[PDB]
Amino acid sequence: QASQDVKNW
Amino acid sequence: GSHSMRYFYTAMSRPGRGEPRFIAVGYVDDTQFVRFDSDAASPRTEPRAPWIEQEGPEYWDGETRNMKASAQTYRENLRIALRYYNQSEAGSHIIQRMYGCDLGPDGRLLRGHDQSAYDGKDYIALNEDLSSWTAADTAAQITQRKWEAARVAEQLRAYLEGLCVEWLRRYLENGKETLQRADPPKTHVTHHPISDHEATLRCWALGFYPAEITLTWQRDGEDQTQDTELVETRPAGDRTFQKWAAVVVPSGEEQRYTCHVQHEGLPKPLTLRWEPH
Amino acid sequence: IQRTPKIQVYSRHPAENGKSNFLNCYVSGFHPSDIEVDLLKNGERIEKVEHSDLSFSKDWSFYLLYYTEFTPTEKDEYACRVNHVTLSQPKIVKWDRDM
């Protein structure tokens, strides 16, 4: 199961 | 014995040809099990291994929603990178990310990973402590500060130590027939004359899984690293792998050369010689 | 910035004339990801060629496998053609069953 992207660059 | 799970993201801008394209693939060891392509008709996370299909509708719907949001996050990330590097909107650029967890031979977390790249170069990496970052350049230090401020590392550590290990262990069990049952290589030595005075001895390993393997040529029990041509390990297309190693031999010396094969599917390392028919 | 692809052309199983097999062209070590890969039979493009999902190695360079079913023969010549931003002209690698 993939991680959820938390935040932007 | 040791196992790992990895996800690989590629996001590429395509100015004048379409919106940015996002591709995600997931691996357990050397076996791909999911994929997502923002370019496909009706983008969905799709299965790529038999053992993952057992998962319910909420798994596939949950993964698809996450991948769609990630693709949108990386669209934004590509625009942000243009700012940091003072780059034009005309060129195409690539962001990559790879992350996942390594399990030791006991089935417990041995290491977590999370790395990002920009245009093929290291950008930012989570350190082995899973709490601090390494920025490769001054642009990445801008991102590093934002991620420290938003407590990003703590959330990633929670994923890597938790759900990552937890889903990997489940996949390994569901796919144990193929994931935890190594295929030993099938091996043989071939002989190819170069002239009447020289020939190539080529040591072949075929149909092995996983991909890790060691092939070495020895002369009189001495290793010949400098004189060995090694091709990179290559996929056969049926989830096994192939490799060969070659050495140039003076005619008449062939039997002094032995090929040594080390692979986890083998009880003991093989020793092979040219066995002419 | 730019890394040129490595190319390997090979069959899934040891080739035997008249026996059904799979022809593979594995391209790796390249950056950026845009690449042209074609498998050729007697210099002409083979119709139904499938390829793997784009992935990359620990050093960030991409890799892809292109493959099609085939039966090797004495008469027919097989090859793989690859074009990339690093290459001025498409480079063609012929299939040698000894590799």
Numbering used by the authors:
A (entry chain E): 1 to 9
B (entry chain A): 1 to 277
C (entry chain B): 1 to 99
Sentences from the study reporting this entry:
To begin to address the structural basis for T cell mediated control of HIV, we initiated a structural analysis of an immunodominant CD8+ T cell epitope QW9 (QASQEVKNW, p24gag residues 176–184) from HIV-1 bound to the restricting HLA class I molecule B*5801. This epitope is of particular interest because the conserved Gag protein forms the essential capsid of HIV-1, with mutations likely to impose a fitness cost. Here, we report the first crystal structures of HLA-B*5801, one of the most HIV-protective HLA molecules, loaded with QW9 and its natural variants QW9-S3T and QW9-E5D. All three structures are in a very similar crystal lattice and have two independent molecules in one asymmetric unit.
The most interesting feature of these three QW9/HLA-B*5801 complex structures is that the conformation of the middle portion of the bound peptide appears varied, even between the two independent molecules in the same crystal structure. Note that in Fig. D and E, the densities of QW9-E5D-1 and QW9-S3T-1 are too weak to assign the long floppy side chain of K7. But their main chain conformations are in convex shape, indicating that the flexible side chain of K7 should point outwards. The side chain of QW9 residue E5 is fully buried inside the binding-groove, whereas residue S3 has its hydroxyl group semi-exposed. Comparing E5 in the structure of QW9wt/HLA-B*5801 with D5 in the structure of QW9-E5D/HLA-B*5801, they both form three hydrogen bonds in the binding groove. Apparently the mutation of E5D does not change this binding pattern. To sum up, we may have provided a structural rationale as to why the naturally occurring E5D and S3T mutations would not be expected to significantly alter presentation and recognition of epitope QW9 presented by HLA-B*5801.
